[PDB]
Design an enzyme around this catalytic site. Structure first.
Site, mmCIF file in Angstrom:
data_model
loop_
_atom_site.group_PDB
_atom_site.id
_atom_site.type_symbol
_atom_site.label_atom_id
_atom_site.label_comp_id
_atom_site.label_asym_id
_atom_site.label_seq_id
_atom_site.Cartn_x
_atom_site.Cartn_y
_atom_site.Cartn_z
ATOM 1 N N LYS A 7 -4.782 -9.722 -7.763
ATOM 2 C CA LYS A 7 -5.662 -9.584 -6.815
ATOM 3 C C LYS A 7 -7.097 -7.697 -7.381
ATOM 4 O O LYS A 7 -6.285 -7.231 -8.084
ATOM 5 C CB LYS A 7 -5.105 -7.694 -5.769
ATOM 6 C CG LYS A 7 -5.662 -7.834 -4.624
ATOM 7 C CD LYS A 7 -4.469 -7.231 -3.055
ATOM 8 C CE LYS A 7 -4.722 -7.396 -2.372
ATOM 9 N NZ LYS A 7 -4.203 -6.369 -1.382
ATOM 10 N N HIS A 29 0.606 -1.112 0.369
ATOM 11 C CA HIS A 29 -0.040 0.316 -0.441
ATOM 12 C C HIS A 29 0.500 1.350 -0.131
ATOM 13 O O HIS A 29 0.421 2.309 -0.494
ATOM 14 C CB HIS A 29 -0.834 0.018 1.126
ATOM 15 C CG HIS A 29 -2.424 -1.442 1.177
ATOM 16 N ND1 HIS A 29 -2.919 -1.024 -0.019
ATOM 17 C CD2 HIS A 29 -1.826 -2.646 1.601
ATOM 18 C CE1 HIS A 29 -3.338 -2.841 0.600
ATOM 19 N NE2 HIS A 29 -3.084 -3.212 0.984
ATOM 20 N N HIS A 45 -3.570 -3.188 8.015
ATOM 21 C CA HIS A 45 -4.383 -3.462 6.682
ATOM 22 C C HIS A 45 -4.832 -2.819 6.292
ATOM 23 O O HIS A 45 -5.348 -1.453 7.259
ATOM 24 C CB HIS A 45 -5.217 -4.885 7.557
ATOM 25 C CG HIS A 45 -7.035 -4.497 6.427
ATOM 26 N ND1 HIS A 45 -6.743 -5.752 6.114
ATOM 27 C CD2 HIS A 45 -7.958 -3.976 7.129
ATOM 28 C CE1 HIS A 45 -8.087 -5.066 5.383
ATOM 29 N NE2 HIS A 45 -8.896 -4.075 6.717
ATOM 30 N N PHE A 46 -5.258 -2.946 5.199
ATOM 31 C CA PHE A 46 -5.872 -1.260 4.186
ATOM 32 C C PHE A 46 -7.262 -1.642 4.342
ATOM 33 O O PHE A 46 -7.599 -2.268 3.295
ATOM 34 C CB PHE A 46 -5.432 -1.188 2.689
ATOM 35 C CG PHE A 46 -5.967 0.159 2.996
ATOM 36 C CD1 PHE A 46 -7.427 -0.038 1.621
ATOM 37 C CD2 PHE A 46 -5.536 1.434 2.511
ATOM 38 C CE1 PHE A 46 -7.706 1.366 1.311
ATOM 39 C CE2 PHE A 46 -5.651 2.498 2.566
ATOM 40 C CZ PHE A 46 -6.742 2.476 1.658
ATOM 41 N N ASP A 47 -8.048 -1.157 5.353
ATOM 42 C CA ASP A 47 -9.751 -1.064 5.534
ATOM 43 C C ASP A 47 -10.675 -0.312 4.102
ATOM 44 O O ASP A 47 -11.631 -0.711 3.523
ATOM 45 C CB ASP A 47 -9.964 -0.993 6.784
ATOM 46 C CG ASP A 47 -11.885 -1.747 6.967
ATOM 47 O OD1 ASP A 47 -11.195 -2.751 6.630
ATOM 48 O OD2 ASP A 47 -12.520 -1.568 7.535
HETATM 49 N N1 LIG Z 1 -9.345 -5.038 11.189
HETATM 50 C C1 LIG Z 1 -8.561 -6.545 10.557
HETATM 51 N N2 LIG Z 1 -9.735 -6.199 9.316
HETATM 52 C C2 LIG Z 1 -8.914 -7.218 8.166
HETATM 53 N N3 LIG Z 1 -7.268 -7.529 8.284
HETATM 54 C C3 LIG Z 1 -7.149 -7.451 9.632
HETATM 55 C C4 LIG Z 1 -7.038 -7.067 10.323
HETATM 56 N N4 LIG Z 1 -6.588 -6.830 11.915
HETATM 57 C C5 LIG Z 1 -5.318 -7.399 11.411
HETATM 58 N N5 LIG Z 1 -6.078 -7.327 9.901
HETATM 59 C C6 LIG Z 1 -4.887 -8.031 9.313
HETATM 60 O O1 LIG Z 1 -3.776 -7.434 7.952
HETATM 61 C C7 LIG Z 1 -3.294 -8.625 7.849
HETATM 62 C C8 LIG Z 1 -3.289 -8.006 6.553
HETATM 63 O O2 LIG Z 1 -4.526 -8.103 5.443
HETATM 64 P P1 LIG Z 1 -5.329 -8.384 4.493
HETATM 65 O O3 LIG Z 1 -6.738 -8.003 3.945
HETATM 66 O O4 LIG Z 1 -4.651 -9.919 3.686
HETATM 67 O O5 LIG Z 1 -3.719 -7.221 3.234
HETATM 68 P P2 LIG Z 1 -4.902 -5.575 3.042
HETATM 69 O O6 LIG Z 1 -3.587 -5.246 2.063
HETATM 70 O O7 LIG Z 1 -5.489 -5.078 3.421
HETATM 71 O O8 LIG Z 1 -5.228 -6.117 1.128
HETATM 72 C C9 LIG Z 1 -6.994 -5.982 2.088
HETATM 73 C C10 LIG Z 1 -7.412 -5.053 1.801
HETATM 74 C C11 LIG Z 1 -7.229 -4.529 -0.106
HETATM 75 N N6 LIG Z 1 -8.464 -3.251 -0.692
HETATM 76 C C12 LIG Z 1 -9.734 -3.278 0.148
HETATM 77 C C13 LIG Z 1 -10.682 -2.063 -0.361
HETATM 78 C C14 LIG Z 1 -9.778 -0.693 -1.340
HETATM 79 O O9 LIG Z 1 -10.027 -0.088 -0.821
HETATM 80 N N7 LIG Z 1 -8.265 -1.240 -0.912
HETATM 81 C C15 LIG Z 1 -7.552 -2.156 -0.948
HETATM 82 O O10 LIG Z 1 -6.067 -1.966 -0.773
HETATM 83 O O11 LIG Z 1 -7.676 -5.163 -0.742
HETATM 84 C C16 LIG Z 1 -7.736 -6.575 -0.018
HETATM 85 C C17 LIG Z 1 -9.066 -7.230 0.504
HETATM 86 O O12 LIG Z 1 -10.347 -6.495 0.995
HETATM 87 P P3 LIG Z 1 -10.817 -6.374 1.868
HETATM 88 O O13 LIG Z 1 -10.886 -7.228 2.944
HETATM 89 O O14 LIG Z 1 -10.867 -5.294 2.905
HETATM 90 O O15 LIG Z 1 -12.394 -6.745 2.008
HETATM 91 C C18 LIG Z 1 -4.052 -9.712 7.416
HETATM 92 O O16 LIG Z 1 -2.467 -10.357 8.731
HETATM 93 P P4 LIG Z 1 -1.846 -12.146 8.402
HETATM 94 O O17 LIG Z 1 -1.860 -11.565 5.916
HETATM 95 O O18 LIG Z 1 -0.636 -11.645 8.125
HETATM 96 O O19 LIG Z 1 -2.354 -13.034 8.413
HETATM 97 C C19 LIG Z 1 -5.136 -9.191 8.161
HETATM 98 O O20 LIG Z 1 -4.718 -10.444 9.045
#
Ligand SMILES: Nc1ncnc2c1ncn2[C@@H]1O[C@H](COP(=O)(O)OP(=O)(O)O[C@H]2C[C@H](n3ccc(=O)[nH]c3=O)O[C@@H]2COP(=O)(O)O)[C@@H](OP(=O)(O)O)[C@H]1O
Length: 124
Positions: A41, A12, A119-121
């Site tokens: 992705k 990110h 994590h990016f929410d």
């Molecule tokens: N509250 C929490 N909610 C979610 N995850 C959390 C939380 N607290 C901790 N974590 C942990 O953070 C790591 C990375 O989270 P991950 O979803 O794999 O990556 P991302 O880059 O955020 O990838 C995410 C976000 C990105 N995304 C989504 C939406 C957007 O606008 N932009 C973007 O980049 O797309 C993907 C899917 O979107 P979604 O899950 O929101 O549907 C994980 O640990 P490990 O992989 O180390 O086991 C996870 O368990």
């Protein structure tokens, strides 16, 4: 064994470019950060702010995470971000992305000691 924090920066953070560059910014970045290595992705956001500024969001506005957890924080100010979304004419391993530059508040989930983004929410 990449740490979640390192993974976060990899997936990110893009402090080099202050805004979404070429129309091909996403195709290039998604590939280079290894985000299309075994699946395209669907969505990924890059943040064009300093690492320190993004890390600071972990002590900003506490909000509910999309998953129900409460370790999410929203940035008080808007930040420069680039959203990369997969196009329908995209098929692994030839992943294709639409690039979208915007300025919005970001919402990240934080964990650990130190307390850093992992994590990016969402962006709002
Ligand atoms: N509250 C929490 N909610 C979610 N995850 C959390 C939380 N607290 C901790 N974590 C942990 O953070 C790591 C990375 O989270 P991950 O979803 O794999 O990556 P991302 O880059 O955020 O990838 C995410 C976000 C990105 N995304 C989504 C939406 C957007 O606008 N932009 C973007 O980049 O797309 C993907 C899917 O979107 P979604 O899950 O929101 O549907 C994980 O640990 P490990 O992989 O180390 O086991 C996870 O368990």
């Amino acid at each position: 064994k990449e740490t979640a924090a390192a993974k976060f920066e990899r997936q990110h953070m893009d402090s080099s470019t202050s805004a979404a560059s070429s129309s091909n910014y996403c195709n290039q970045m998604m590939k280079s950060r290894n985000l299309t290595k075994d699946r395209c992705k669907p969505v990924n956001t890059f943040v064009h702010e300093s690492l320190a500024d993004v890390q600071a969001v972990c002590s900003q506005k506490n909000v509910a995470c999309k998953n129900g957890q409460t370790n999410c924080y929203q940035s008080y100010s808007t930040m420069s971000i680039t959203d990369c979304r997969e196009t329908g004419s995209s098929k692994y391993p030839n992943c294709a992305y639409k690039t979208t530059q915007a300025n919005k508040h970001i919402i990240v989930a934080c964990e650990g000691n130190p307390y850093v983004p992992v994590h990016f929410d969402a962006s709002v």
